[PDB]
Design a protein around this ligand. Structure first.
Ligand SMILES: O=C1CC[C@H](N2C(=O)c3ccccc3C2=O)C(=O)N1
Ligand SMILES: [Zn+2]
Length: 105
């Protein structure tokens, strides 16, 4: 089965069935302009989230997709981002592995 929760509150965010092989792997190692290296896991579906701010294509790690920040809908923890703007798929979620916790139903 297997699902992914907000590590700060237990909120259910997504699950393994929903991983999306972007580029060929669901996991991307990236860094940002702050010099922080995350591991980002890509889902085609997520629930339990609140999106914040405007879509933005600056700094995007993924070609043709703008991002908006995704917060845990329950606790406000920054779980990662929602991506929109592209084709096959149009939108998807890029979530910071470290901020989730993977366990069972
Ligand atoms: O696709 C993305 C999501 C946004 C993400 N991001 C951050 O992790 C960051 C940290 C500090 C300043 C600016 C940003 C930025 O745009 C980033 O670098 N790429
Ligand atoms: Zn939470």
């Amino acid at each position: 089965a297997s699902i992914f929760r907000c590590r700060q509150c237990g909120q259910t965010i997504s699950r393994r069935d929903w991983l999306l092989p972007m580029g060929g792997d669901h996991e991307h190692v990236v860094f940002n302009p702050a010099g922080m290296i995350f591991r980002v896991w890509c889902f085609s579906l997520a629930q339990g989230l609140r999106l914040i701010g405007a879509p933005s294509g600056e700094f995007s790690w993924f070609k043709g997709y703008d991002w908006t920040i995704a917060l845990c809908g329950q606790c406000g923890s920054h779980l990662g981002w929602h991506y929109e703007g592209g084709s096959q798929p149009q939108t998807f979620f890029g979530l910071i592995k470290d901020r989730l916790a993977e366990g069972p139903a």
